[PDB]
């Protein structure tokens, strides 16, 4: 459950990401694949080589989804319904994996936007990603 300050912090920090969302999305995925190799098994037919065009494209997909979630932080279940169908119903992604990607997203943010990554914003972004992960790993249809 996000506080008003959390919502404020998420929107401001993600806004600062701006046009780099796709770039950061891809970096977070690469960090996850390299740091936690087991996560690659969820993408059996992907070209996960470094600099992969496919991973670049997927990073943009992931980033755009988060942008959408940020715009509907008060109505995520409805906004991310289709993504939940995919991750929870079809892929049945183990929730531990969402913690891994959530952590890599934070590492990516901290590596690119140091001035924005304050303890308070860090805390807010963590809750937000945990919230998003909860929605995507739950079957609520």
């Amino acid at each position: 459950v996000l506080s008003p300050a959390d919502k404020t912090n998420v929107k401001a920090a993600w806004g600062k990401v701006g046009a780099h969302a796709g770039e950061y999305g891809a970096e977070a995925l690469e960090r996850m694949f390299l740091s936690f190799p087991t996560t690659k098994t969820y993408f059996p037919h992907f070209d996960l080589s470094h600099g992969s065009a496919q991973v670049k494209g997927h990073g943009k997909k992931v980033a755009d989804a988060l942008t959408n979630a940020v715009a509907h932080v008060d109505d995520m279940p409805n906004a991310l319904s289709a993504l939940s169908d995919l991750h929870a119903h079809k892929l049945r992604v183990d929730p531990v994996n969402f913690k891994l990607l959530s952590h890599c997203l934070l590492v990516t943010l901290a590596a690119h936007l140091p001035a924005e990554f304050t303890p308070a914003v860090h805390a807010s972004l963590d809750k937000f990603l945990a919230s998003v992960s909860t929605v995507l790993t739950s079957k609520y249809r």
């Binding site: 390299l34 140091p114 303890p119």
Partner: protein, 146 residues
């Protein structure tokens, strides 16, 4: 006993640039701010009521320095993390009863702090190496639970 020759070189090389007086305090401070229930284990540390209060608390900064010292001890004995943290494991598990999930969280907060300080220098390969270190430190500390 895990960890490749190249990962060890990467960890050692980056660690030689880490500010031992700051990083630990920043990591512990953030742990307390991002995962508020951990504040309960530090009741005597004083004011932990706000992010600024936590990050400015001298006792938090001082303790973080000891924590970082322990991480350094581990990095100097990467093939024997179990032995390096044996005593600390007794304290955190038998005495303080800190749930092991918290050890993993501190490890990842440390990684966020390293990313924050090093920026571009904290590359995916460097992070992967460090994920092995913190996972090993976390498991070593939870040893008394096994």
């Amino acid at each position: 006993v895990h960890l490749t020759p190249e990962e060890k070189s990467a960890v050692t090389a980056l660690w030689g640039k880490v500010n031992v007086d700051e990083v630990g305090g920043e990591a512990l401070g953030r742990l307390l701010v991002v995962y508020p229930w951990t504040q309960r284990f530090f009741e005597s540390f004083g004011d932990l009521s706000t992010p600024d209060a936590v990050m400015g608390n001298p006792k938090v900064k001082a303790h973080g320095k000891k924590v970082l010292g322990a991480f350094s001890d581990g990095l100097a004995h990467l093939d024997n993390l179990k032995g390096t943290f044996a005593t600390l494991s007794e304290l955190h598990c038998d005495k303080l009863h800190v749930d092991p999930e918290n050890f993993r969280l501190l490890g990842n907060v440390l990684v966020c702090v390293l990313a924050h300080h090093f920026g571009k220098e904290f590359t995916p390969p460097v992070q992967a190496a460090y994920q092995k270190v913190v996972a090993g430190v976390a498991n070593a500390l939870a040893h008394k639970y096994h």
